[PDB]
Amino acid sequence: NLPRVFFDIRIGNGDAGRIVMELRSDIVPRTAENFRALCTGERGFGYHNCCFHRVIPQFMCQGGDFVKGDGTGGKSIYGRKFDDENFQLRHEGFGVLSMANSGPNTNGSQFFICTTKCDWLDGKHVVFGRVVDGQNVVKKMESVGSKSGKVKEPVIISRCGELI
Template structure:
């Protein structure tokens, strides 16, 4: 999952997260983005040859500040595939298992965007990923 996310952050294949809008916002819970095709949760795909793949079961807990892939494409056995959409978590989510990273800085902005969501999860604030890339922590 992290390799896929990194490739989309870096636009390695000519597409990725730059220009994506936040299409779901749940106050105090999470925001969802990463649909670079439709900007509404119905598009986006992985950076790999296979457009969708089964996520790693990392066992990492979904708590405030974590990042995980959003399951979308469903198979008959109900195991959700992932592509490009991801969730920034603001509160513990017990059933969310596709965690692979964490927010280093700026969680207050995520709180603000999430708080703009209505009862259906539609954000009132138009939020766009203008630029993205890798962030290297000082070792």
């Protein structure tokens, strides 16, 4: 069965709600497991209290740097980096979950949520899931985003984990 995980999001001084994500363990089991484990914090580290450090309205939101908090760091449950598992899933529309990287085979913890179809990213980033509920919460983040991506108020994963 496909993992169901969540982020509770706080934007500035307000709780924004819950994002629920389905992970495609059927296609990218290793990549899905990394993300799932970082949501639950079962290895002793993960996305809890991590921020979204870039928000570009109508393009995407990026987060998952729980090491440095600024988009320069991160680590996976497999070590500092792990290989691109496959490129079978596409950045086909709103809510697609994909791994940020610094070139081939440099996956860590950073990820982005697409808020539009971005086919041009296919074959560059490993897609591993999709937002299934709380699309409004992803869209809410735009209130503190900008065209450059600079974030105006803290966007924090106040709580995260796995759902039944």
